[PDB]
Amino acid sequence: PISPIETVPVKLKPGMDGPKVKQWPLTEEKIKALVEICTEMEKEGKISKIGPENPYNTPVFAIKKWRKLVDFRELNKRTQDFWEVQLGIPHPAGLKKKKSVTVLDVGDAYFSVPLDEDFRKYTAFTIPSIETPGIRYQYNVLPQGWKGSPAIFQSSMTKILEPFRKQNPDIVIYQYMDDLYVGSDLEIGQHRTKIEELRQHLLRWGLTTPDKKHQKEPPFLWMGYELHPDKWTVQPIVLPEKDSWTVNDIQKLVGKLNWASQIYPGIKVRQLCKLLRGTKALTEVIPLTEEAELELAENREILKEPVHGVYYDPSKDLIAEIQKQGQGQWTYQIYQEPFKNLKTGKYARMRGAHTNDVKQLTEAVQKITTESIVIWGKTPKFKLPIQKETWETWWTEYWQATWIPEWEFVNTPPLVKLWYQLEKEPIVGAETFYVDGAANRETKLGKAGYVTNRGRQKVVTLTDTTNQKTELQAIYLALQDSGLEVNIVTDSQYALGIIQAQPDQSESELVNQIIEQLIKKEKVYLAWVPAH
Amino acid sequence: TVPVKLKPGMDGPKVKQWPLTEEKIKALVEICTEMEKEGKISKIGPENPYNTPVFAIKTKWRKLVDFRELNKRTQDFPHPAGLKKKKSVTVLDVGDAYFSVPLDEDFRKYTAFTIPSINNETPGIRYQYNVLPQGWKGSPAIFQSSMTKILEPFRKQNPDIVIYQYMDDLYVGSDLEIGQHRTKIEELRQHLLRWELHPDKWTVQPIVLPEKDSWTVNDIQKLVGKLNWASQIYPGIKVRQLCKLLRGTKALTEVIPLTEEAELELAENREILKEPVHGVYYDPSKDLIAEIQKQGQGQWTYQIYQEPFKNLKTGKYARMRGAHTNDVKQLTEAVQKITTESIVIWGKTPKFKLPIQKETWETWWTEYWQATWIPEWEFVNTPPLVKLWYQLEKEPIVGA
Ligand SMILES: Cc1cc(S(N)(O)O)ccc1NC(=O)COc1ccc(Cl)cc1C(=O)c1cc(F)cc(C(F)(F)F)c1
Numbered sequence: 001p002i003s004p005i006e007t008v009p010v011k012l013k014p015g016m017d018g019p020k021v022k023q024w025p026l027t028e029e030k031i032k033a034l035v036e037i038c039t040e041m042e043k044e045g046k047i048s049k050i051g052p053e054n055p056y057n058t059p060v061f062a063i064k065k066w067r068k069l070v071d072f073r074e075l076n077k078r079t080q081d082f083w084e085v086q087l088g089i090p091h092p093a094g095l096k097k098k099k100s101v102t103v104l105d106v107g108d109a110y111f112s113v114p115l116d117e118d119f120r121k122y123t124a125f126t127i128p129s130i131e132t133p134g135i136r137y138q139y140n141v142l143p144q145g146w147k148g149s150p151a152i153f154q155s156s157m158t159k160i161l162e163p164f165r166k167q168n169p170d171i172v173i174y175q176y177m178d179d180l181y182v183g184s185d186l187e188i189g190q191h192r193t194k195i196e197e198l199r200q201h202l203l204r205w206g207l208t209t210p211d212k213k214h215q216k217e218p219p220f221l222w223m224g225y226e227l228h229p230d231k232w233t234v235q236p237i238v239l240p241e242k243d244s245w246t247v248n249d250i251q252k253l254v255g256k257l258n259w260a261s262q263i264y265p266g267i268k269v270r271q272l273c274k275l276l277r278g279t280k281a282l283t284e285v286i287p288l289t290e291e292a293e294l295e296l297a298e299n300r301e302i303l304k305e306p307v308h309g310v311y312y313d314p315s316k317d318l319i320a321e322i323q324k325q326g327q328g329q330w331t332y333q334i335y336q337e338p339f340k341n342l343k344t345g346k347y348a349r350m351r352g353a354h355t356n357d358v359k360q361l362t363e364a365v366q367k368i369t370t371e372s373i374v375i376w377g378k379t380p381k382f383k384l385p386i387q388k389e390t391w392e393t394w395w396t397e398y399w400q401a402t403w404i405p406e407w408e409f410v411n412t413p414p415l416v417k418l419w420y421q422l423e424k425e426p427i428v429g430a431e432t433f434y435v436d437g438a439a440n441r442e443t444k445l446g447k448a449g450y451v452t453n454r455g456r457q458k459v460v461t462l463t464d465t466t467n468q469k470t471e472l473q474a475i476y477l478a479l480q481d482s483g484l485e486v487n488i489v490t491d492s493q494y495a496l497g498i499i500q501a502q503p504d505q506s507e508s509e510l511v512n513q514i515i516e517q518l519i520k521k522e523k524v525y526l527a528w529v530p531a532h
Numbered sequence: 533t534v535p536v537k538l539k540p541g542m543d544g545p546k547v548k549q550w551p552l553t554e555e556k557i558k559a560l561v562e563i564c565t566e567m568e569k570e571g572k573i574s575k576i577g578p579e580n581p582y583n584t585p586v587f588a589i590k591t592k593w594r595k596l597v598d599f600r601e602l603n604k605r606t607q608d609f610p611h612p613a614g615l616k617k618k619k620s621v622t623v624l625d626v627g628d629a630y631f632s633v634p635l636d637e638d639f640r641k642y643t644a645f646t647i648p649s650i651n652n653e654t655p656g657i658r659y660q661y662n663v664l665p666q667g668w669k670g671s672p673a674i675f676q677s678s679m680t681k682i683l684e685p686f687r688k689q690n691p692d693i694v695i696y697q698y699m700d701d702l703y704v705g706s707d708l709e710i711g712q713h714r715t716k717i718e719e720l721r722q723h724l725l726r727w728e729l730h731p732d733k734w735t736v737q738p739i740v741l742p743e744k745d746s747w748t749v750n751d752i753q754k755l756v757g758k759l760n761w762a763s764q765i766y767p768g769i770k771v772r773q774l775c776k777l778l779r780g781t782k783a784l785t786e787v788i789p790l791t792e793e794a795e796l797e798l799a800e801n802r803e804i805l806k807e808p809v810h811g812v813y814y815d816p817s818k819d820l821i822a823e824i825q826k827q828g829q830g831q832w833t834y835q836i837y838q839e840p841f842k843n844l845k846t847g848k849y850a851r852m853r854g855a856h857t858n859d860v861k862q863l864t865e866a867v868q869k870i871t872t873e874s875i876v877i878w879g880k881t882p883k884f885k886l887p888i889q890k891e892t893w894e895t896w897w898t899e900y901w902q903a904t905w906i907p908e909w910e911f912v913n914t915p916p917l918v919k920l921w922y923q924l925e926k927e928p929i930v931g932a
Pocket residue numbers: 090091095096097098099100101102172173174175176181182183218220221222227228229230311653
């Protein structure tokens with residue numbers, strides 16, 4: 001049955017016209033099946049037999065009795081845009097715990113909405129002949145596979161659910177694709193009563209809701225998760241055992257494994273990723289190394305762990321703890337009460353051009369903050385492995401505006417600290433190295449060196465080098481040859497940046513070498529001076 | 533209603549809604565429900581593909597729609613140089629004025645906006661405006677004949693007071709004593725209710741070079757480095773004689789007696805810096821640019837200009853009480869203060885160069901925004917010298 005609901009005014013993109021796609025010819029076997037399916041839809045009021053007036057047409061096919069398939073790809077190319085049909089999908093950690101939850105499938109089979117009469121002509125299609133005229137039709141309802149159907153379907157369900165919602169504030173209904181999720185904290189019998197009242201309400205609008213045979217029951221499959229009444233678990237992750245792995249297999253496997261590192265602790269893929277080096281074909285077979293076999297082996301075991309979480313309780317605190325798993329790697333878990341996680345996560349190592357750990361910490365805090373607001377509409381209280389004095393010292397001086405929402409210190413190693421802090425003033429009694437480096441940027445031949453106030457000096461010859469690398473190399477040599485306290489003068493513009501940001505990680509192996517050196521010194525003062 | 537269109541070839545805004553806090557989502561739902569009843573806005577379908585960000589600010593919540601994009605695409609349509617001279621200016625929010633006025637039926641779809649749903653459990657609530665929206669370029673424009681009429685009396689009554697309107701704001705500027713000023717304001721509010729800036733003080737501070745009993749190699753180094761850079765603003769600045777004392781490989785800490793030539797060079801330089809570079813004038817055909825640098829510990833420096841090194845204005849902003857642990861709070865505060873002065877002075881907002889990471893700012897700025905308008909901004913990496921240089925800006929003898 002069709003619904004007695006107003007139509008939404010649809011239009012075709014700017015100036016474009018309806019499709020005129022030639023009907024792919026079929027076999028007598030397929031035509032008969034289509035002619036049947038279509039006579040059934042014609043009586044239901046879904047399609048209308050139409051004349052030659054219509055210059056438009058969409059191809060119809062036969063798949064599997066037989067099932068009909070209309071290829072609207074072309075209509076969809078010429079159909080106006082709509083408001084992005086709810087793009088962000090719900091995360092189980094944001095679902096409030098409810099006593100009862102029931103799923104109502106309002107799919108197309110059960111849900112038929114009328115089409116904007118003005119637009120119906122563009123949906124025209126033709127059932128071929130055995131040479132002679134074929135049978136022409138057009139849709140009177142939202143076609144399955146057409147661009148606007150998901151949006152108009154959702155908009156319609158919303159209009160229809162408005163009354164019920166105002167009348168049952170103790171009940172919450174979530175919309176996602178063809179399904180309605182209805183939950184409440186009412187007594188199970190009362191809950192069931194309201195579901196039935198709703199079903200009867202959709203029935204009134206032309207929505208024949210489900211069959212006892214098509215009713216979904218707990219747990220629920222929510223994109224890799226299993227939603228149980230009091231908690232969620234994750235659908236088993238299967239790692240195929242083989243004696244022959246191709247590039248494609250390894251990549252797929254890495255893919256599936258990277259997703260698991262989010263929920264599971266200890267997942268590693270370094271040795272499996274190594275297998276991808278120099279690969280010439282996807283089908284190419286790469287023998288697993290010894291370490292890859294072990295890694296894969298240990299992961300199979302980690303995935304046999306019963307990782308579970310719980311649901312949201314708005315009357316309780318929202319807490320998020322963070323750990324540094326390695327340089328640039330951050331792990332986190334958001335919970336309300338100790339050990340009962342709502343959600344856990346990991347942020348792939350960021351390979352910046354140059355940054356520091358405290359900065360990377362704020363970036364993790366910000367990503368979690370954004371995630372939380374989406375999921376819970378609130379920001380968590382943070383537990384960060386950094387002292388309040390370390391934070392104060394860094395942020396207050398840093399050239400860039402930065403911030404962390406309300407947080408507290410949790411002493412869980414390793415802790416994030418400032419690996420070094422350039423002196424504010426020149427060091428008295430410390431050798432002063434005047435460094436300098438130059439190179440022909442074309443020949444890439446250069447020299448680096450220094451001359452200290454104490455008479456010490458050096459110059460190194462470098463081939464295949466840039467001017468930047470020599471200048472930085474100059475600084476590096478001064479750091480090597482100096483004592484634990486050193487003043488260094490340079491006209492390097494990039495060094496000026498180091499004084500400002502004082503990075504502890506970067507893209508240059510050279511800068512990295514310098515940082516290791518900076519860290520090792522007890523005192524370092526960097527002074528920049530204009531060249532010449 | 534008068535027909536309003538988009539600039540030629542411009543299509544409507546399709547800006548996505550940022551996530552909001554449950555607090556703000558609840559607030560907007562309540563505000564918008566009441567507005568629907570009063571016929572100011574109406575729910576819309578999915579056939580309307582446009583969208584404009586919306587949010588709530590501030591002890592009850594106010595709805596604030598980010599129309600920057602739409603304002604840009606809206607067809608085009610004077611400034612009282614006297615406002616900037618006045619002793620005191622008070623700012624007033626006159627956005628409610630617009631609700632009465634209807635918006636062309638054909639333009640409404642472009643005002644579409646969405647109230648998001650927590651955890652994406654439900655589709656957002658879509659609306660569009662029926663009447664003039666607060667924050668849109670066209671509103672102050674359309675409601676102009678109506679605004680003059682209501683202002684004529686108060687104006688003609690007090691020809692000494694200047695009143696300037698920007699977006700939803702009204703800047704009232706006069707010369708009366710603080711009390712006589714606040715009194716004139718209510719007389720106006722009453723007049724309106726029936727339907728603390730000080731520009732003369734905003735003095736441009738000069739750059740001051742350090743003076744020392746004795747100078748060290750480093751002292752001169754840092755000094756010469758800044759003067760060199762500054763040579764881009766003032767070509768008469770010289771570092772020759774100073775750079776000579778820097779000959780050799782002395783210890784960064786060694787004291788260097790200054791030659792008489794370096795002493796004079798330092799004196800000529802101080803004199804040049806005594807005043808703002810000559811020949812800088814505001815150009816209406818050009819955009820205003822506001823650059824901010826984080827000096828640290830609550831201090832911020834900014835420069836307003838249109839051409840690099842040709843400042844129209846520069847200044848310092850010290851963080852306000854109760855903003856200590858919040859860099860984002862301090863920056864938005866500063867942005868609003870600078871934008872306000874900009875309006876007062878030129879009647880337009882400047883585009884900002886903010887020393888903050890995109891993600892950091894976009895996540896928290898609305899939490900401390902308090903203006904009806906929103907300026908344009910871009911995120912940047914502060915050059916070390918630009919910071920070191922404006923840090924040299926002069927400050928009060930004892931204070932103020
Ligand atoms: C899974 C469950 C079963 C029972 S019951 N009736 O005892 O079997 C009671 C509560 C729950 N769940 C909860 O407490 C928390 O979960 C929920 C809390 C409220 C609502 Cl309305 C639905 C759920 C879901 O479990 C759920 C399941 C899905 F597949 C998809 C979605 C959605 F699309 F909305 F994201 C939500």
